[PDB]
């Protein structure tokens, strides 16, 4: 039972059971339910410890890692509440020129991407979204589209 990476937990505030994934950092109340290639979109928030602390939006990225996590956490909130489309937030705020494609990164096999990014992408099912995903480039929201 439970697909790869998925676990069961309990809210400390309500005692209600929920489900979460260690590889993707996704979490949800609903019970969840390997290809050669996957296609994902992403939204990257960089921080001052990113490998290259620079992006098309900002010549020198100054924010802290914890500050980047709070932006990512707020963007996920906007996405899950339906206040904002994933594509609209990536186009505007992703610290990566994949923003021009609304976050699309194309299709890729294993062996190309940063490993935690790769592991998260291949643990997502088509249509699913990650929680914060930590890599040397910063913090990612990943959306698997194929």
Catalytic machinery residues: 42, 96, 114, 137, 140
Nearest Cα to Cα of residue 50 among 134, 144, 130: 134
Helix (H, G, I), strand (E, B), or coil: what is residue 74?
Answer: helix
Nearest residue to 136 (alpha-carbon basis) of 50, 63, 65: 50
This structure's resolution (Å) is 1.9
- Distances in whole angstroms, Cα of residue 4 to Cα of each of 79, 119, 133, 145: 24, 11, 16, 18
Domain 34-144 classification at class level: alpha beta
Tokens representing 58 are 């900002």
| CA nearest neighbour of 32 among 67, 1, 11 | 1
**72 three-state secondary structure:** helix
R_g (Cα) of the chain, nearest Å = 15
Experimental technique used to determine this entry = X-ray
Q: 71-104 burial, b if ≥16 CB within 10 A, otherwise e?
A: bbeebbeebeeeebebbebbbebbbbebbeebbb
Question: Residues with Cβ < 8 Å from 14, sequence gap 6 or more?
Answer: none
């Amino acid at each position: 039972k439970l697909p790869p990476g998925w676990e069961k937990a309990m809210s400390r505030s309500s005692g209600r059971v929920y489900y979460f994934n260690h590889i993707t950092n996704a979490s949800q109340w609903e019970r969840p339910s390997e290809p050669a290639r996957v296609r994902c979109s992403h939204l990257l928030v960089k921080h001052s410890q990113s490998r290259r602390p620079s992006s098309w939006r900002q010549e020198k990225i100054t924010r802290t890692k914890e500050e980047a996590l709070e932006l990512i956490n707020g963007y996920i909130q906007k996405i899950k509440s339906g206040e904002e489309d994933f594509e609209s937030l990536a186009s505007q705020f992703s610290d990566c020129s994949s923003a021009k494609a609304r976050g699309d990164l194309g299709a890729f096999s294993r062996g190309q991407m940063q490993k935690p990014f790769e592991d998260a992408s291949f643990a997502l099912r088509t249509g699913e979204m990650s929680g914060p995903v930590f890599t040397d480039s910063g913090i990612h929201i990943i959306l698997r589209t194929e």
